[PDB]
Amino acid sequence: ETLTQEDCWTVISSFFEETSLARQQLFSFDEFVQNTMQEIVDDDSTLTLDQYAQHTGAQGDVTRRYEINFGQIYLSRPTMTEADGSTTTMFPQEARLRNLTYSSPLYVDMRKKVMVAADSNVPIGEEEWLVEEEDEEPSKVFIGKIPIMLRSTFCILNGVSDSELYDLNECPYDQGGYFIINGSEKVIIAQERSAANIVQVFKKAAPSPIAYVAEIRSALERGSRLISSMQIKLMARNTENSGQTIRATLPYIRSDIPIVIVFRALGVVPDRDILEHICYDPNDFQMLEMMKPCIEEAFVIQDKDIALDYIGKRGSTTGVTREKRLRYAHDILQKELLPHITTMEGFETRKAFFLGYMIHRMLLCALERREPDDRDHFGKKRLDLAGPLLASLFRMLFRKMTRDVYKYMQKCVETNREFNLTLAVKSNIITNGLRYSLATGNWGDQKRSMVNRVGVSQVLNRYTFASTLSHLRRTNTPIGRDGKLAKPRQLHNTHWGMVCPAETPEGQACGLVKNLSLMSYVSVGSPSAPIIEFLEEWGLETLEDYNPSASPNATKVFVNGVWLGVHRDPAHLTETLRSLRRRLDISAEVSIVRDIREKELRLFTDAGRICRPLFIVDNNPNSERRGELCIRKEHIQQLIEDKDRYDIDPEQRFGWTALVSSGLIEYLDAEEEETVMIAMSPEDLEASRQMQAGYEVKEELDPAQRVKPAPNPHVHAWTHCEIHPAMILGILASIIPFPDHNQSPRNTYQSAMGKQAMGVYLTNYQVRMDTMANILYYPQKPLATTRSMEYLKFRELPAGQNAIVAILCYSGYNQEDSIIMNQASIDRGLFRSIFYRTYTDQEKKIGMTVMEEFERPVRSTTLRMKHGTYDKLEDDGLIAPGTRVSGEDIIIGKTAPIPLDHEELGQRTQLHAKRDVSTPLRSTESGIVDQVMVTTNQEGLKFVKVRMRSTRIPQIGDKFASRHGQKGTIGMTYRHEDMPFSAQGIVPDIIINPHAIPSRMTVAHLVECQLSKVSALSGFEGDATPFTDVTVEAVSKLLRSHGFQSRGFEVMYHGHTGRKLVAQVFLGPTYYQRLKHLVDDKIHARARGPVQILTRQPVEGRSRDGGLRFGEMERDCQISHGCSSVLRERLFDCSDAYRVIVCDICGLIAIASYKKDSYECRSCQNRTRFSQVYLPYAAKLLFQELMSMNIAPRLFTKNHK
Amino acid sequence: HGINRAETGALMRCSFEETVEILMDAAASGEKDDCKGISENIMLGQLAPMG
Amino acid sequence: LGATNRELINNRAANR
Amino acid sequence: TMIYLCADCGARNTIQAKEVIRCRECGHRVMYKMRTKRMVQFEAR
Amino acid sequence: MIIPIRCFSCGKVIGDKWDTYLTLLQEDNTEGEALDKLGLQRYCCRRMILTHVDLIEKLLCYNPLS
Amino acid sequence: DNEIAGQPQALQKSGRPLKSIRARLKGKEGRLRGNLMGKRVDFSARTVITGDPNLSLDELGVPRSIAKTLTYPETVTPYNIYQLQELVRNGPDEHPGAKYIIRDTGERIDLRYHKRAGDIPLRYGWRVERHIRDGDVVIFNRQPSLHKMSMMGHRIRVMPYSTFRLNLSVTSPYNADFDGDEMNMHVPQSEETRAEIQEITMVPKQ
Amino acid sequence: GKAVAKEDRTTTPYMTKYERARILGTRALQISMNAPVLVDLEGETDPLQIAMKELAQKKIPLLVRRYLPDGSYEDWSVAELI
Amino acid sequence: MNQPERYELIELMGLPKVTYELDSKSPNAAVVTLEKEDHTLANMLANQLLSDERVLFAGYKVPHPLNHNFILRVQTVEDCSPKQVIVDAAKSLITHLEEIKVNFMREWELKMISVE
Amino acid sequence: QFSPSSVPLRRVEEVQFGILSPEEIRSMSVAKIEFPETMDESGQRPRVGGLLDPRLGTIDRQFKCQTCGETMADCPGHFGHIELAKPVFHIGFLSKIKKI
Amino acid sequence: RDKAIGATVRIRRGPMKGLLGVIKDTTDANARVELHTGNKMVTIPKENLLYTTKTGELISYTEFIERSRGIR
Amino acid sequence: QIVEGKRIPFGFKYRTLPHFPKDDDSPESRGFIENSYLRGLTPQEFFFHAMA
RNA sequence: AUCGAGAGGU
């Protein structure tokens, strides 16, 4: 009656049956579209304009009020309207092919209203509005187009079966979770931020004048979701002042207000009240002693009105009357102070209570009673997914659209023109803004590009199925990528189960870019009202009636960072809340953290909290199953039975949700993990349980197995248990076999290199015209596989091959991380691949005249024709599929008319009227035209895409890698006869050097080879899942059972001499990957060619025939060598040699005519004394740039002593 | 702070972290450069007088 | 929604 | 003149000079060119 | 894609055994037993039947026609 | 100077700060660090490196394609006129051959586009840009160039395949290995530079 | 700049490695431009090898003008240098 | 792109199949260069030569795997020549292979008759 | 190599930094720049006196600079001048001006 | 302007006999030819190439010149 | 396993992972891997080694 | 072409 690992994997299988790997993106977007858009519309629902009566002296002057109310929003399915005006439903593949944004139009119900003031003599603002005119029904008005995330509930592919996906040219394996903007796929990278409504106390480092700072980043639940931030700074002890003063930094205040003054502005004038707010214990004298100096500092202000005046004088406005200053101070104190607590009248008591709480926390850290906060604790951070981000963007864009509508109202009213609702809205605002933000990633308005966030949207990575899965689950921390702050980059303890420990890029973004674990769930947010209602009805004492003195031992209750009140029995409250969540009466995303030392009960329901699921251990006092998992074997058998059953209703099967709603699985975030005790496996629970039942928990232990620490006797109750430790890994770390037998940076290196492995990325790559694609001819699934691969679908779309690898020193061509590849194996298709590239062109147009034509250009009329071949183009200016092209051969023929007024030296004969703008093939590439797609673009102009294919056979210089960070290039290829063989005639496909193994300590590579050999011999698949009881001893026994040396060695013979090698070789199958780094993609040589126009130096880039940079370090190396002429050649004769004539009198470049051999300096009237200077063109450019700043850099060739 | 304080040629120092400021100072003081260093000769494309 | 999506996909020729 | 294939039908469409790219049994606005008439030879190594 | 004609290492023709391999599997034969019945003794020749993934069938589902 | 403190920047019509003269002269990419103390150079190849146990310590194995691209401008004299004539006869496409002939007046004959390239008698004082051949001297380096020993002289061996092949014991001064490293090759274009590379910079001397 | 007398010369009497590289390069460059060769040729075609064999016989007609830091200089014949 | 054509492993392109030169450094020593040949011929030829008493030295090398050829250095006693010992070893190997062939064919015929 | 010149080739031994005087700027200039335009009404040629004055240098491979008559590969580019309405501070020199 | 450039050709004699290609460039002696297979690119003497005509025939080099001259 | 020169830090409150109790200074809690690469790391050891 | 952003390589 103990849970097994097979049962754990059945539970995980159910999880992934009901959960997609793109679930976070999809659910966030669904939340944004279904709910957040309506809330954003409502928050700015009404627009009102009051036309007062100007005193023009004409009888008939009456004030008017015009009102526009924005109603419900309607989102249709994505559609396209053509040039001819026909409107059709649009499908993702057509959008990808024709470069169309896959967006759905949005309509909003607007209603208009006009009212007349009852009397015009009333003071402004007191006019009574009588209903004059009103729209009987609303007008459904198109306001914009929202890009639709693929596979979301509003996509055309939602609820669509596999067969219909094929009919649409869609891969059933594709998970969606992205957008199509102008044909390109864009994924929104989750953005990490610090949580709002949390008080964080930070110790400022010396010699900063501030000792400690308590900061809260207050955000309204839905009212723009984050505006105000406050600080409470304690100032450092000074030799002049015997005490430290507490000053509150508030929005829109130029100075730090002493805390007592802001308390008085809140009505807590008496000192006793203030120190009861701050120091809840009268008997504690250190707190009051530290508060005394600020009371001393703030005695000059003893009343609320004087405190408000003090605040107002320090507002951003100077030279204002006292009444306005007091009004402004009260307005700031009400609205811009702690808006998450409240923003409405009569709530100064709660804000004062929370301010006292913040001061108490900061002084607890200043007394060194509690440690400061950890800025990097994962439970204090939130992930903004597509939902929240698109919500902020749409709020901004809808505000801009409403401003436009209001300006339209004002302009129409001024001119007495009739107001039309349809003409009022500039629908281009929302459409263009969303399109621009999703396309460029620059997050915000086009006009605030520098201040906007960047890189929020990235082109989806279609190199391998696993790389795409990884890209859909990527988080970015917007820390400075140049500043060297190792702490944010480090792997925190709280990352356990939330972020992948291994998968993180190497380089500047190491540790900042993170990847969600397999079972990590990111909350989308839920209402806090039901939870507050349950708290109120269960005995929550409101904060208005709370008196700390009466109940100092009672526990503060927070919800979303709002101190709602105080409870007297927080244990029972917490058990009741947890029970409710365990029935889903409360949302499963709700964090219920009881902090016993701090006497707090924090509830969280907001979005962005990363959670992970865990088993629940039965802890009920009267239960007969103390210390045993709630989930029985019966529940597992139910999962197996309902997995296959399809006759059952799809929504009424027993699966993952049935476990959560039944109280057998619980989602915990990092905040709640701090209050739980988690067993690492059911066997650990059991061992602890016998240890606690008096049994010795002792037995004969397989010496080959991992050694675990003995069960801790100090642990008597476990609250949870992990479903499987292997779930702490990401997409790519879950493809590594035996990752727990490797040195961790090798796991990171494999996680990075698995993205670049060649395979089949989508099944529909044939019908997709991608810019770049690399496809493996004969992909094979690994012989050694992890159980997590079933959910990553690596067996379905693998990205490598099982090569027979021998670890041997054979001819010395595999040294320094090179490999030797069998040439016969290459000839038979090993690691062969296809490279597809796509060239896009289209017809342009300006005004009413088309200035481009897809045609076969003719030498006799087209000016400036390229040097490539125009003979492979067909009559329609294009190139047919199946033809062979190379280098600069033209694949698309396009011409542009020239203005009739242009006269280019007569080179443009009377026949020459056009100019060639054709598209040549890349100079460094050649192949066969695979495909030529022809269509029309959004503007009804012709639009062509030419896909070329080119087979790449492995050769010397091509990167290959194992799944263990073992990367190399091919150094040499030997044929079948020349390679070492076994007594069966097995010849390895690859030979790798032994020296790669010891230093790197990639023992997982050797264990993989042995296990793959066993599985190839026996046919059973090899389980390489981490943290299993699969030992090398068991694999050795299995291998010996097949008539092989147990450790994987084989007697091999020399191919050259047939002699039996003195050493026995480690030979067996290992999964290798062809990497996107091919030598021919990189080989580059330049003799001469293009130069930059400005500097006249070799251009940059292999693709554009550019030179290589001779940098500062190379110059230093040649200096230390002493090779003066080498430097002169590299930096002058080979880059930008140039000649000028300087005047020997003034030292400035002269006017030189070499044709006439006449030189002149008008300034000096010099025509005889000149010098010839050889210098870099960049030097002459620098000198001219200086002369443009009135600096005269003068070159004198003779010592002017 | 230390390298640019040295009384070396103007071009040699402007090649290090204070380019326009150093050039402006040299212009303001009417400064003269001997072209006896490495950076100056390399910039002017002449055979460096060293090695 | 699934049925509507199926209807829209299958008749894309007729609805065009 | 030039014949293209309806990306849905695969039906041969004889588009002419400056005509909307559309399928006449399938309304599809994406079509493909046809395999060239040139000789295609590949060595089997 | 489709099963390779010959093995990568041994050069043995395996392209005429994929159908036989699948048929053997349908008859309640383990993959090891089926490979034994196919006379694939070298594990290099066995790995390619064992680890082959048939993407040709999935690529044939995107037929422009029905 | 558009980076003045306390002033509004002169923005672009595309919402970008203007490129002031100070910005052109300033920075790593400025004139004095991106165009004067460092440059893009002609007659340089780059590619992946593999190992060759059969190469001499001072030899660099160069791909045929790179050898065909890069050329050395050898001056025609009574001592080489015959071999230079043979190289001109071979043409730019047959290695070892030649690509250009530079006359006394400076005019540049392109042997590919000259209809009768092979039938051109050579005259003393001309130059022939002949393919770099086995035994030619080149500078070879890897980045970052942390010390003198990261740019060393090598003798060419033009050979098949697309990688730079070099002796194993030379990896250490370059800090190079064959897991994907790419290295650069610079071809000296004068007798003086050749003498310097051969007499100071060569691998055995290092 | 004042030329130092042959007897007063204080610099090293050996050819420096930099001097050797510069001398060989300069002589090879001059030979490539048809400078008369001052040594018997056994069929050598590379100007650098011709300059090397001229050096071995001390037949390079070149001087080294070694400059002292103050500006005074010493002229050393390639033949007399060791 | 820089691949060599595989037919270059079998085509001489005008090179001589066998080159024979006298090693001047040593007496009665010769170097035989065989183009488009590899360890198949060289190994057996050198082993057969070393079965011979008149052969003081017999070794072979393949200077580079990217060139298909091999060098064979043979030194004999003063009373014989390297060329004669090489030819005698080659003739002996031809005869040996001929018995291998004949006996294989006879045994194969016997075994097949046994099958029937 | 470059086109032949009778002026002897010399090494630069002195970079004398200074400030261009107003008279130096006026005299060393070849065209007074007054018009903000680059192109002209006719369009076939830039504006004479604008910001692409042919006397100010050639950037078209077609034509030869009027100032020197040389191709785009031998014309270094000449300097114009703008007569300011009233003097303005040189931002690079502001601190030195203040100190003086 | 050579008339051979752009003409489909097969290799008559040599190790690469029987391979199809298109003459990208042509010197007086040899033609630089773009083979259809393996992205290969070769230089082959004009005399070593059969030329493909409009009717599918293969003709010799001298036949090609005699056809191009147009004398009849 | 050593992070910033010290044993694995208490990133939770007085524990390194939610699998140990508070104030556990034992070798296993703070990042001592008694296993070898051959034998395999336990999940806690795997995480600590990943941190290093 | 220019500019900006991003993904990568050693």
Residue numbers in the entry:
A (entry chain B): 10 to 1210
B (entry chain A): 1393 to 1443
C (entry chain X): 481 to 496
D (entry chain L): 19 to 63
E (entry chain J): 1 to 66
F (entry chain A): 311 to 516
G (entry chain F): 61 to 142
H (entry chain K): 1 to 116
Please quote the paper that reports this structure.
Xrn2 activity is stimulated by Spt5 to ensure efficient degradation of nascent RNA leading to Pol II dislodgement from DNA. Using fission yeast as a model system, we demonstrate the formation of a stable complex between Xrn2, Rai1 (DXO in humans), DSIF (Spt4/5) and Pol II. Our results support a model where Xrn2 first forms a stable complex with the elongating Pol II to achieve its full activity in degrading nascent RNA revising the current ‘torpedo’ model of termination, which posits that RNA degradation precedes Xrn2 engagement with Pol II.
Size exclusion chromatography confirmed that Xrn2/Rai1 stably associates with elongating Pol II-DSIF, forming a potential Pre-Termination Complex (PTC) (SDS-PAGE lanes 7–14). We were able to obtain high-resolution 3D-reconstitutions of Pol II (at 2.67 Å) with nucleic acid scaffold and additional densities next to the RNA exit channel (corresponding to Kow5 of Spt5) and the region in the vicinity of Rpb2/Rpb10/Rpc10. We suggest that Xrn2 uses a small α-helical region embedded in the mostly unstructured segment to anchor the enzyme to Pol II. These interactions are mostly ionic with arginines (R492 and R496) of Xrn2 interacting with a negatively charged pocket formed by Rpb2/Rpc10. In addition, isoleucine 489, located in the middle part of the Xrn2 peptide contacts a hydrophobic/negatively charged stretch of Rpb2. The region of Xrn2 engaged in interactions with Pol II is located between two parts of the enzyme that constitute its single catalytic domain.
